Amino acid sequence: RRGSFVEMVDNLRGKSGQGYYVEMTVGSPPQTLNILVDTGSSNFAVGAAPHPFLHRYYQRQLSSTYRDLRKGVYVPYTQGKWEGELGTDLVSIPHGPNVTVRANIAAITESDKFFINGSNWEGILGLAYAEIARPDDSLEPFFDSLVKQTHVPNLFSLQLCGSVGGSMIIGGIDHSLYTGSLWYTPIRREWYYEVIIVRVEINGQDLKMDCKEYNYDKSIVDSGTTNLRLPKKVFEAAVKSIKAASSTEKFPDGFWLGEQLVCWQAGTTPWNIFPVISLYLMGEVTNQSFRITILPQQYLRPVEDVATSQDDCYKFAISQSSTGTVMGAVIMEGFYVVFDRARKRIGFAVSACHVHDEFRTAAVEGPFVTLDMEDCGYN
Ligand SMILES: CN1C(N)=N[C@](C)(c2cc(NC(=O)c3ccc(F)cn3)ccc2F)CS1(=O)=O
């Protein structure tokens, strides 16, 4: 099958600011779990104990196909940790391909700041590469296992629509999910989904920064992050320009730092005072680039769970980083994104579900002439 996969359309669910999850089954007979789709990590890890925030959890004792690996894995992040016991079991995706694979599963037995109180998911599906798997690259990621064990083509694509929805098309592309053409950027290295940004424009105005800065020390595509995250020096310049572009209204310093929210009376958000953001990405051809353009609809996130206000409150979802640029849900919700593993490239097209007003629309445009794009990468 190619170009059309109706069975996989709308197979993603979520809640605002809590991410996008797919239904999966593990073990025999099959146990159903909701699993966060994460292109920014490479472990398949699931709740395996009755943590009070969990709707449900993997019960290894009930599975005839479970195999213990007799190894543990401890995984700390910046603000959260999990620890688990490694095994393999049979895994399938009910609204995905008609297959069942034997995959590595980390059965989570202790965690902190990992499961979200009030969320509807019980595990994470790391879709990135073995190089960043925990404990090490010998632990084969789920997608690698899927590709090895079946005839599913080595590609998946994501349409994230900002409760939220979307599509994860496994092993192909569904042409109804986008308009215009796909444009492809090389995956620089197979660890995270690493790409190179060669130029940044706010409202069409170049930031005029050494492009090496845009990728200090990394730029990645990550469905498991909400924000567009930028290196501080780039974030500094970006806000500076966004501040200027939006000067007809004035907002507090903390707002731009995500230390407080800003609110407006319902239906009266000044979208138009806010500038578009354009990232030019390295193209497929020497000296050729393309640009993807997002709206304030993307970087101004509605905050729903705010009991002390009755208005429309938003978070500024652009933030600074020490680990490089992260193109999170803020970017991806604008686009249909094709993770073309077989070809080591990521395609972007205008998403058929992206949220936009009648004056501006997210865009994917090319080709553009950009020299010295190699020098944009950090070593
Ligand atoms: C950035 N990170 C990432 N991509 N993957 C991890 C596994 C992760 C992701 C989430 N992601 C989310 O909860 C989330 C929330 C809203 C979104 F739009 C997208 N993702 C939660 C826990 C966790 F360990 C670790 S992380 O360092 O935090």
Nearest-angstrom CA–CA distance, 132 and 155 = 19
The question of whether 222 is a catalytic residue gets the answer yes
- Give CA 313 to chain center in angstroms: 23
> Which residue type sits at 90?
L
- Which atom in ligand 1 lies closest to the alpha carbon of residue 223? 19
Nearest atom in ligand 1 to the alpha carbon of residue 43 is 7
Residues 82, 35, 197: CA angle, nearest 5 degrees: 85
Q: Which two tokens stand for residue 13?
A: 């669910």
For residue 94, cis peptide bond before it (omega within 30 degrees of 0): no
The one-character DSSP state at 206 is E
Q: For ligand 1, what atom is nearest to the CA of residue 45?
A: 7
Shortest-distance Cα residue to atom 11 of ligand 1: 224
List the structure tokens of 360: 């501006």
The residue whose CA is least distant from atom 8 of ligand 1 is 224
Mutate to test the pocket of ligand 1, among 34, 124, 315 (most ligand atoms within 8 A of CB): 124
Of all protein residues, the one whose alpha carbon is nearest to atom 9 of ligand 1 is 224
From 38, 89, 174, 312, the catalytic residue: 38
Q: Which residues line ligand 1 (CB under 6 A)?
A: 17-19, 38, 40-41, 77, 80, 114, 124, 222, 224-226, 329
Q: CB–CB of 106/84 below 8 Å?
A: yes
Q: How far is the CA of 11 from the centre of ligand 1 (A)?
A: 19
CB count within 10 Å of CB 72 equals 14
Whether omega for the bond prior to residue 217 falls within 30 degrees of 0, making it cis, is yes
The residue nearest atom 25 of ligand 1, judged by CA position, is: 77
Instruction: For residues 304 and 342, give the distance between their C-alpha atoms in angstroms, rounded to a whole number.
Output: 40
* Residue 192 identity: Y
Q: Which atom of ligand 1 is nearest to the CA of 224?
A: 20
What φ, ψ does residue 93 adopt, rounded to 5°?
-120, 100
Q: Which of 16, 15, 34 is nearest to 24 (CA)?
A: 34
76 residue type, one letter: P
How many Å apart are CA 342 and CA 330, to the nearest integer?
Answer: 26
Distance (Å) from CA 322 to ligand 1 centroid: 16
Ligand 1 pocket mutation, candidates 42, 77, 112, 220, criterion most atoms within 8 A of CB: 77
The residues near 70 (Cβ < 8 Å, ≥ 6 apart) are none
The 3-state DSSP class for residue 365 equals strand
- Choice from 35, 36, 222 to test ligand 1 binding pocket (greatest atom count within 8 A of CB): 36
Beta-sheet pairing, 228-231 with 325-327 = antiparallel
- Name the DSSP letter for residue 221: E
Q: How many CA atoms lie within 13 A of 190 on its CB side?
A: 12
Write the CB contacts of 88 (distance below 8 Å, at least 6 apart in sequence): 66, 67, 69, 102, 103, 104, 105
**DSSP strand pairing (219-221 vs 325-327):** parallel
Q: How far is CA 84 from CA 36, 46, 58, 64, 229, in A?
A: 17, 9, 12, 20, 29
Distance 372 CA to ligand 1 centre (A): 33
What Å distances lie between residue 165 and 169, 373, 375, 377, CA to CA? 13, 35, 38, 34
Beta strands 178-186 and 19-26 are unpaired
State how far the alpha carbon of 302 is from the alpha carbons of 52, 59, 251, in Å: 27, 36, 17
Strand (E) or helix (H) holding 44:
strand 44-47
Q: Among all chains, which residue has been given the structure tokens 């444009």?
A: 183
Experimental approach was X-ray
145: left (phi over 0), alpha (psi -120 to 50) or beta: alpha
Distance (angstroms) between ligand 1 centre and the Cα of 43 equals: 12
Element (H, E) at 198: strand 197-202
Q: By C-alpha distance, which of 40, 378, 347 is closest to 192?
A: 40
Q: How far apart are CA 16 and CA 322, in angstroms?
A: 25
Cβ-contact 28, 39 below 8 angstroms: no
From 144, 222, 312, 340, the catalytic residue: 222
Structure resolution, Å: 2.1
Task: Judge residue 64's burial from the number of C-beta atoms within 10 Å of its C-beta, 0-12 exposed, 13-18 middle, 19 or more buried.
Answer: exposed
Q: Are 46 and 123 in contact (CB under 8 A)?
A: yes
Closest C-alpha residue for ligand 1 atom 22 = 114
Closest CA to 155 of 347, 350, 349: 347
Ligand 1 centroid distance, CA of 131 (Å): 18
Give the helix ranges, DSSP H, for the chain. 142-149, 232-245, 253-256, 296-299, 329-332
Q: How far apart are alpha carbons 170 and 153 in whole angstroms? A: 8
Of 56, 264, 37, 279, give the one whose Cα is nearest residue 167.
37
Of 148, 113, 115, 112, residue with least CA distance to 130: 148
Rounded Cα gap, residues 12 and 8, in angstroms: 9
38 labelled catalytic: yes
Burial class for 127, CB neighbours closer than 10 Å (0-12, 13-18, 19+)? buried
Compute, in angstroms, the gap from residue 173 CA to the centroid of ligand 1.
24
**1 C-alpha to center of ligand 1: Å?**
31
Distance CA 289, CA 259 (A): 35
Phi-psi group of 311: left, alpha or beta (phi > 0 → left; psi -120 to 50 → alpha; rest → beta): beta
Residue numbers after which the chain breaks, C to N beyond 2.5 angstroms: 162
